[PDB]
Structures are given as C-alpha cells and as structure tokens.
Amino acid sequence: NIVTLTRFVMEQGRKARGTGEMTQLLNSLCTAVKAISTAVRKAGIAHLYGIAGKLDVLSNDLVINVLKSSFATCVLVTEEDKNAIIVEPEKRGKYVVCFDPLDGSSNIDCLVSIGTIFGIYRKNSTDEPSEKDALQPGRNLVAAGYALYGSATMLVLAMVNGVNCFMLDPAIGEFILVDRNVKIKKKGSIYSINEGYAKEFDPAITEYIQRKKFPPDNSAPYGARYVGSMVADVHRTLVYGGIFMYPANKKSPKGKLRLLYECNPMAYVMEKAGGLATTGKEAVLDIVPTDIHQRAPIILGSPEDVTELLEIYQKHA
Amino acid sequence: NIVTLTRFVMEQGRKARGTGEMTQLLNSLCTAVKAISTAVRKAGIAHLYGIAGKLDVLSNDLVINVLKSSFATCVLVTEEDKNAIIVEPEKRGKYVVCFDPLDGSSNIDCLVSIGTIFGIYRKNSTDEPSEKDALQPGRNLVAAGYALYGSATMLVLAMVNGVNCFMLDPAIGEFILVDRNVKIKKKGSIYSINEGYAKEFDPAITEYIQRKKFPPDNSAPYGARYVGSMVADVHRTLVYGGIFMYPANKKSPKGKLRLLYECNPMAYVMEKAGGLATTGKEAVLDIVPTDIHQRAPIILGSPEDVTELLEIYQKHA
Amino acid sequence: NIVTLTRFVMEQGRKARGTGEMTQLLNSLCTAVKAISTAVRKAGIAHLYGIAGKLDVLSNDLVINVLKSSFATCVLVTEEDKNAIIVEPEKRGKYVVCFDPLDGSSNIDCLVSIGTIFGIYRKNSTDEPSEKDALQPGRNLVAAGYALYGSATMLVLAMVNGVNCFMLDPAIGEFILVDRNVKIKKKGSIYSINEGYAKEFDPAITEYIQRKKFPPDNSAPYGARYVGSMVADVHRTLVYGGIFMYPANKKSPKGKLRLLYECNPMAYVMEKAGGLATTGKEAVLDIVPTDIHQRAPIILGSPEDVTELLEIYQKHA
Amino acid sequence: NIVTLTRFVMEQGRKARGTGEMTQLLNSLCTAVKAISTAVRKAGIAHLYGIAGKLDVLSNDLVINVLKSSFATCVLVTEEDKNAIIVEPEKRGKYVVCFDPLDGSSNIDCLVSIGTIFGIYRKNSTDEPSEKDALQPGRNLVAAGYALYGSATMLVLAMVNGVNCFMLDPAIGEFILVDRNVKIKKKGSIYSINEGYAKEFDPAITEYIQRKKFPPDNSAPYGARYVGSMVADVHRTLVYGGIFMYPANKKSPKGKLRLLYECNPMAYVMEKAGGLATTGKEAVLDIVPTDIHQRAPIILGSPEDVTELLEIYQKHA
C-alpha cells in the first residue's frame, strides 16, 4: 500500500464531489513539475555540448502550456510576465493560478536548491476574466504549495484539509506521499535572514537577532541558516522549525518578496501547518492586493518564534 | 568538442605517462559518485513505500567497495570510520584516499545540497600500509575535489595542472567538462559564516564581520549566505567569489571541520583556483596532521577577502 | 498542447459521468506499467552485482498490489496464480481484472521484447465475489489493452470508443498519446506463425501458408516474422497489418494461448481496430469460458487476411 | 566483485600494453551506445509532442562525432554513408571502424529490438588513409561486437581473448559485466530464417529446413523464430543456441546483409564464442572485400547445426 499524488488528488476530488475540473488542474501541475525537475537536473546537457552536433524561460513555458492545456484556468499570473495571462476561451476553466516557475534563479549558476511556487484561486465574479480576478487576499486560496528541486524533488501541497508532502521517485516519475498532515514545531532553534542588511534593519528586527545570538535568559543561542532561495529556507523551516524573515529595508520599503506568488502560497502552507506568517504589522493572508507584482515584507515560521518578534515589534510602536 | 570525465582522465594519465593505476582510481571514484547521486535523488524510493514485491552508510559502502575493487588503493580514511581502513594485499595499490562520503548529513531530511569530498595521497613511505600513511600535509595531495548533489550534480576535480568542473548528464550517466581551468574572482561580495556563534567569535572575526555589514567607506555591504553544507557554501565561493569561514569557537576550539577529508581537499581546490585557504594563523595545506580525525579552523575564498581578514588577525596579536 | 494518459483517462471518465472508480483503476494500471518497465530495462542491476555489497514474480506482485490499492477491484485473475485473487472487503470495488503481468517470460534471457496484457470486466451479479465473475465472454469487456516493453515502452488501450496508443517518455514518467483511433490495415503483407510445428498443422493452416509463400495468382509472397512474444507479434500486426496465428496442434488441441488474459484482450483490441480474431471456427470474443486458465486457438489481424483463411477453413469442413 | 566496461577495457589495455589509443576508442564507443539507447527509449519525446518551451540519422551523427573526437580513428565506414569517411589529420588515429549505427530500422515504428554493429581494424598500410584501408577480410578484426536495444540494453564485445556481455544499468549509466567468456551451445533447437522466400531458396536450404520441421528419425522438430532484426536474432542464437540464416535469393543474389559492418562483426563474435559463420561455400571472415557496401550471404550459429547444413551444401555440388 502506497499513496501516489495521482491517487491522492483523485480521492480528494471525489470526497469533495467536484466536477473534476480542479483535479485536472492539480494533475497538470504535477506533470509540469516533473518536466521542470528533469530540466533542472540537466538531463540531456551533453547534446548542448555537441555530443551529436533560459532555464527560467523553459520553466515559464512549461507551466503556462501545461496549465492552459488543462482547460481549468481563466487567468494565470507569473513572475516572468508583466501582465496576467488570460486563457483562450476554448481552454477556459474557472481557476486563477499565480506562480513563480523557478524561484532562486540567481542561485542557478551555483547549483543551489531552487523551486516552483504556486497558488490557486477560484474566480469570483461573473464577467470577462482579467487581472482583477488574481487580486484576491491570500485568505481566498483554494490550494497552494511548492516544489523544491534540492538533493531530491519534493512537492508540498496545502489545501483546507491540511499540508501533505510528496517525494518524487524519479525512476518511475511518480510522487509518493511521504508525510501527511504536517504540523510545524511550536518553537524552533534556527533563524533565517540576510544579515548583510543589518545596517538597514528596523530596531525590532535588530533587537530580535541580538536576542538570538545573545540570549538574555542565558539559554542556548539560535543557529543561523540562509540558503538564498525562499523555497529552500521556508521548506527547512516547515520541517525543522524556526523562523524565516525578509523584512523591508533599503531593498524596497515593501520588502523584496512578491505577495501573490511567493508570500501568500508560503503563508497559506505555513498557517495550515500551524505556524504564522506576518508582515510584522498584519497577517500576510489578509492583505488586499493592489497590483499583481506587489511586494510585501514577510516573517514566517514556528508560532512561538513569530510571536516573540511580534512583541518586540509592538514595543517599538 | 564534447569532453567527458572518462576521456579527460585517460588523456591526462597518458600525458603524465602513468601506469594507468591512478586512472583506474579516478574512474572508480566517478562510478561511485554516479551511484550516490542516484541514491540521493531518491530513485526507487517507491519500493520502501510498499509498491510491493541509511543514506550516509550506503554512501560509505559504495565508496569503500568501488575503491577497493580499483586495485589502486592501500589505505582509506572515512569520516564514518574510527580507524583507517587497510586494503587487502590482494587488492592493494599505491594510493591513499581520504574522504567524506556524504557531507552535510544533517541537511538530508531538509533536502538541502550535500556532497562527497575526497583527497588522494601517494604512499611514499614504502612500508606495510598503516594509519601513518594518511598523516600527510595537504601540500602532498596528488588530487582532490568534490561532488555536489545540488539542483544538478557536479564533480570538481583539482590536480597540479588546474581545477575543472564536470556536470553530470543523468540521462546518459556521463560527466561533461563544462568549465576548464577554473579561477576564483580576486574579490567577492558575499561572506559565509554561522553568525549564531557571534557570542564566541574572536575579536578578529568579530571585527571583520561588522566591517562587512557596516563598511568604513560607505560602500555596499556584503550579502550573507550560509547553506550549512560545506560543499555547497564552498562551491558558491568558488563559482561566485567571496569568503567562507568556520573559525574556532567554544564548542569547537579547534574548529569543527576535519583536516584530511574536508579542509585539505577544499584548501587544495581553492589554491589551484587562485584563492587562499587559512587557519587564520597558517595555511591549511602546510599542517602536518597527528590524528586522522583531527579538526582544523578554516577560512577560504577570494584572495583579497582572505588577506583582509588575515591583516585583522595580525593586528590583534 | 499534448495529451497525457492521465489527462485522457480523466476526460473520458468525465464524459461518461463515472463515479471515478474506473479512472482510479486505469491510473493504478498506468503506475504499475511504469514500475514494471523500469524493472525490465534493468535500472539498479549494479547493486545486484555488488556495487555497494524473479522478474515475472516482481511483475505479478506490482500489478496485484497496485491494483488492490485502487479500491476498484473485487476479483483478479493472473497467469501466475492457480486461483483467482478475491479482494479484501476493505479495498473492494466493482471491477474484475484479468492479466498476464509479463508475457514472453521465456524470452527474458535473450532480451527479446516482452509485455503485459490486461482485460477489465464489470462484475455482473450481486453476491460474494468469486472466480465465476471472471468467467465472462470477451464480448463483455469494459476495457482491454497491453504494454509492450520493446525498443520503447508503449501502452495500447482499447475501450468501446476505440483504440489509442501511448508512448512512455521515460524522462518524465508520463505516457504521451502518439496515435489516436487506430484502425488496422485491410490487407497486410506479413504472416506470423511458428512454422516449426508444420508437421502438426491442420490442412487449412497448411494450405494458407503454402498460398503465402507460393501465390496461385502469382502475386508477391508474404514476408515472415515471428518474434516469439505475443505482444510484440500482435503489436506489429496492429501497426503494420498482416496476420498472427497460434492454432491448435500437438501443443494442446486447444492451442497454447490463454483465453481470459491473452486471447480476449488482444481480440478486443483487434476488433476495435477493425480487424478480426477467430479460432478458425468461432469469434474468440464469443466463447463462454469454463475455467480461468482455459486455452484457445487464435488467428487475428487484417480482415481480408483473416477471412481468406476462414474460407480455406470452410473448404476443409 | 563488480566489473564495469570502463574498468574492464582499461585493465585489458594495460595487460596488452597499448598506448591507450584503443582504450580511448572503446570508451568513446561505449559513450555513443548510451546516447543511442536513450534516444531509442524515447526519453524526452514529450518535447516533440508540444509540452512547450530521424533516429537512424541521429544515431549516425552520434557515432561519427563521438568517434572522431576520440582521436583514435582515421577511416570510418557507415551503412548510412555512400563513401568512407576520412578523419581530419588533426584528429586521426590508427584505427578503422566499420559500423551500422541503427540496424533493423524498418522495425522502428513497430518497436521491435534494434541495435548497433561495429567492427574495428588497424590501418596497416601506412599511406594516406583511404577507402582501401577498410577493405580487409574480417580475419583481420582487432575488435567487434554489438549493442542490442531490446527489453534491456546489452553490449557484446569480442576480441582475441574472448566474448563478454555487458548489461546497461540506465540508473547510473554504467555497463556491468554480466557474462564472461561466452561460448555457444554445440547444438541448438531453433532455426531462424525468413521462410517467405521459400520460392527462391536453393535446394540445400530447402532440404535443411524441411529436415528441421520433419526430422528423419522422429525427434522433436526445431522451433522457428525470426524477429527481423539481425542483432536480435543473432543475440538469441548466441545466448540460446541454434542457427540464423540469410542465404542468397533472387531479390538478393549475393544476400542482403553487408560484409564489413554486419556479417563480419557477427561472424567474428560467433567464432570467438565457439560457433561457425559461413557463406555456405566459405567462411565469412576469409572473404577479401572489393566494395565497402559489398553484400554477402550468411549462416551462423551452433557448430553442429552449421556443419549439418554445410554437408547438404556439399551434397548438392
């Protein structure tokens, strides 16, 4: 007895008495992720080096095409696209999908873990689809998750029911359910942030970090880890517990991370796992977007760790 | 045209006029790395999950076995073994290999990049091979390098004539020379260290770090990155420039990283790439070891960055 | 735009307003076939040869387990099993599946193309499931098909709507629809039969062969091909046209091929493609089975070729 | 322990004391075979089918390119090329290679086993390399063998010291020695020939065939098998015993199969395996060719079977 993503999605669509439109969608995503995973591990590179005689771009095209061919979407928002993609009326479904095809594109050359981030909305309204359909607060997410191309490829899927992790057996091209109903640690022992911006941190952030390296109660300090790819850092947080942070600074007073296809998908996964995701002031999932490429600060992770910072945030208010 | 590791290695052994003993060794190694990469990527995991009909220990066995059968080694030192392994008189060769089968094994469950590290010495004290044979300064390395199981698998090989990077094409199980004679930037813009140990850093490290976040002449501060996997952090240093540091601290008064199978191979690769690798007080490669599992502090990366920290070390002494 | 087996099955289940029980079934079969294909191409053989220190049986277990875990079947009949497998009431569905996990097992050692054969029945009755549910004339098949592990792996699926061929892209573990609504040639130019039994053929068969090598109308003779694996011979017939024959002789007066899991699945595929499948006397699909391992003679292929023999059969009646 | 083609080849070159030139050649060949196997198995086909972003010609290019780059060849003869290819003075070596990149190309669309055939001669007439250099009797072969892309990929290598079979483990892209010093059964029980040419067979062939179906002393008749792919039929002959025949007929008065890249390599493998390979009148290996694309009749297989047919040939003359 083994559960595959294909089996799982189908049983879940069945319990929910769906028309089967969203199952077609989740199955198209699984296929797109397997195709990207293969391109990322460099299968076929020899041909490129003349054996017989871009990666973000290939990833964008794969997701966009595999999604359109699902006949389940009406609007697609990608980090690589200035405007939202409105689906041809022939292949139009009722879902709006926001995604980042290959996050951590800067790390590609250094071979660091990279990933794909997606969020699915049910179109709410009754008129010609447009960007406006994508502009829904994260709280309205039907499903969200990510695929991490690291030492192994894993798909983490979060829906109203919970968070489940699927490992890719590359030998048979099938995702195996390896961890179900995942809940994050109440309090972790690792903090993640680019301290190279110390000079730009607000006093609350500055204070938290200080408390982590030099514990006022003389407890053990927190270990530091900052991979440089959100999916890798967040995935480690989900699994090992701790806190990830990318607050505003000179690097945009609005933070660097995008709201629709990065912050929201990850906040949704986080909340479903039993942790928190805040901007320091408000819950990420409650922000009403104004633009499809709107950035937003984010702090996420174990509840006890995110609350501790939230307090320091209040103190300096 | 297309250059494969196999062709490159043979061609080099020919120019060198070797008896083909080292070529067999390097060919065995390459085979062991493709086997580990496959296990690491979780090929066949569906069988553990009951479709019907560890990873560090498995890696150790692969390396040990594939190397013994090469008939080119007499002494083996693994991070996984307390004692040095002495090869059977029947399979003995003239080479001594020091290796870390799967480095970054804490990052396994979090799916972060991990790797294999190897250093190769030639037994010169023709006596019954013993532990003593491995106790040579890194300055005596014949060959050294590593395999990084990241977003893609890469094998970095360093020898007297240079450093060359080989990318694995998993479709045909062949390593392709993607980069020839690799040389690191003189000065980088990323520092890598576990700042969670800030409370235990010597004044030289402490000063250098603060100088990176708050530059005297108001220049751009360095970005921070610390994956937590030496092979991954060092590969980023090699490819993009910067400095990696794992200094001595209370928990590790002599550092954490081992001399023979971690510090030395990375120091050797760094030097051949045109960079520096220091203890803070002396060059890693000149240290004559006393214990096979001896630890050593290490700082490596671009020459201009490593020098700057070396000056601060001189200033506080 | 590309159609995958997963997409295809889902859209077909949707058009048919099914509960989704048969889709779960066809999806479990696709997974089983990918797992068998991988075992057949010998991935992981190195471990068997001690790199770090039955095939029909593995195939039986894979199909049986993957099928039971679909929760869509009540009775399974396998060539490798003396008795029919009655599903645990926990995982009991309404379908009866007859299959040959790995046909051409004798050819394994010689590396000749081998395959899997399956036929799906809807249980008809309302009582405790038993072998008796498998004993339905082939005419009652819901779906049937085969997977051929040859130079490439292909799944041919036949349902009331028609016959469609899916090629396995082993890189992404997905079956791609490469040929839809396949129809066989009216008259082919190849005959397939083990002529080593010439001494045992009845006069009609003897006469047909003679007419093929020495055309009475002085037309070009037919080419001969007999791989030795039914799936390969039949698949070539479907694609290139011609006739395949395995009539009775000293090798059982009932022929060698089994009725439920070999003859029927292939006759069903054949008829749906627009060809014929006969025992010489009657249509294979109309035989009422008496035993689950009942053998039956079979002649199949292009209509004009099968009719020509049928006439010679009548002449000697 | 585990023996890989790479290790085996190097070890043999060492014992032979070669300059490593032939080893490079055999290593290049092995690389070309893994590349063809992958293309043959349809890895990446989903890209032709619009997931968004020949086979014989491709095989030809792979072989030609991978061989030229080995710097070990001066003349190449392909079934795909009218003229013999003369390697650039810059990449020239001392070896001449005669090959059939993808044999059985008619069986491609039917997914039947196909393969690559190669014969290697040493240029002895040290003159500007020309077509003349390839025109050597097979008796002068340095090495010969084939790659069979069947249910699994296998590489059969024959040299002065014997025939060895290597199975490809596609997971790690390594060929494993599965069978050492292969020797064919003295007498088999399967005959292989296209009986659709019965109307054009000489009396010797005609008599031998009828003697196989109707044995004088009532013994068991031989089974018939004719895949239609030489590499596949000959591999079965090699592994299981028997006889393969492609005699001269009206359509092919001198036979169909080519001498240099089909008959010779298979004749060489047969002789080293302890079998016979005849034209009916003379040994295939002793024929001194006049044309690079010269055809020749061929009969090979177990010694006892081939002799029996040779006697019948003597009787009718």
Ligand SMILES: Nc1ncnc2c1ncn2[C@@H]1O[C@H](COP(=O)(O)O)[C@@H](O)[C@H]1O
């Ligand atoms: N595979 C699924 N898993 C969980 N819920 C689903 C699935 N498919 C559909 N649903 C649910 O039923 C609603 C409508 O489904 P649908 O008719 O497929 O568009 C969805 O938006 C979810 O609430």
Ligand SMILES: Nc1ncnc2c1ncn2[C@@H]1O[C@H](COP(=O)(O)O)[C@@H](O)[C@H]1O
């Ligand atoms: N493939 C090779 N590449 C570069 N140098 C080699 C190679 N093989 C052997 N050598 C060198 O020649 C020495 C003796 O080689 P060997 O006879 O193979 O033991 C080595 O220790 C190196 O100095």
Ligand SMILES: Nc1ncnc2c1ncn2[C@@H]1O[C@H](COP(=O)(O)O)[C@@H](O)[C@H]1O
């Ligand atoms: N994927 C499918 N493709 C074609 N027909 C299907 C599919 N699934 C179900 N059906 C049909 O609907 C009937 C009952 O389906 P089910 O409720 O899934 O058991 C089947 O027996 C077929 O007639």
Ligand SMILES: Nc1ncnc2c1ncn2[C@@H]1O[C@H](COP(=O)(O)O)[C@@H](O)[C@H]1O
């Ligand atoms: N790997 C090998 N295995 C067996 N014999 C070899 C090998 N390499 C070279 N030889 C032999 O030694 C001769 C010259 O080799 P070479 O110097 O490599 O050109 C060959 O033609 C064969 O006789």
Ligand SMILES: O=P(O)(O)OC[C@@H]1O[C@H](COP(=O)(O)O)[C@@H](O)[C@@H]1O
């Ligand atoms: O994909 P991008 O645009 O290259 O950025 C990735 C993001 O970049 C962040 C890191 O940026 P900093 O260097 O500023 O820390 C990660 O947290 C996210 O993956």
Ligand SMILES: O=P(O)(O)OC[C@@H]1O[C@H](COP(=O)(O)O)[C@@H](O)[C@@H]1O
């Ligand atoms: O394989 P190990 O014993 O788990 O250690 C890996 C090493 O551990 C260092 C990081 O450890 P810290 O958490 O102490 O920084 C890395 O740079 C090296 O990969």
Ligand SMILES: O=P(O)(O)OC[C@@H]1O[C@H](COP(=O)(O)O)[C@@H](O)[C@@H]1O
């Ligand atoms: O799987 P099996 O039991 O080995 O047999 C396979 C069948 O065996 C038939 C051939 O048998 P003959 O040798 O008698 O022709 C093929 O047509 C079928 O694949």
Ligand SMILES: O=P(O)(O)OC[C@@H]1O[C@H](COP(=O)(O)O)[C@@H](O)[C@@H]1O
């Ligand atoms: O590659 P080709 O030109 O298609 O030919 C393959 C050969 O063709 C012979 C069979 O041809 P016949 O149909 O004439 O028997 C085989 O034994 C050899 O593989």
Ligand SMILES: [Tl+]
């Ligand atoms: Tl991106």
Ligand SMILES: [Tl+]
């Ligand atoms: Tl991004």
Ligand SMILES: [Tl+]
């Ligand atoms: Tl971003």
Ligand SMILES: [Tl+]
């Ligand atoms: Tl380790």
Ligand SMILES: [Tl+]
């Ligand atoms: Tl380590």
Ligand SMILES: [Tl+]
């Ligand atoms: Tl260590």
Ligand SMILES: [Tl+]
């Ligand atoms: Tl069987």
Ligand SMILES: [Tl+]
């Ligand atoms: Tl069978």
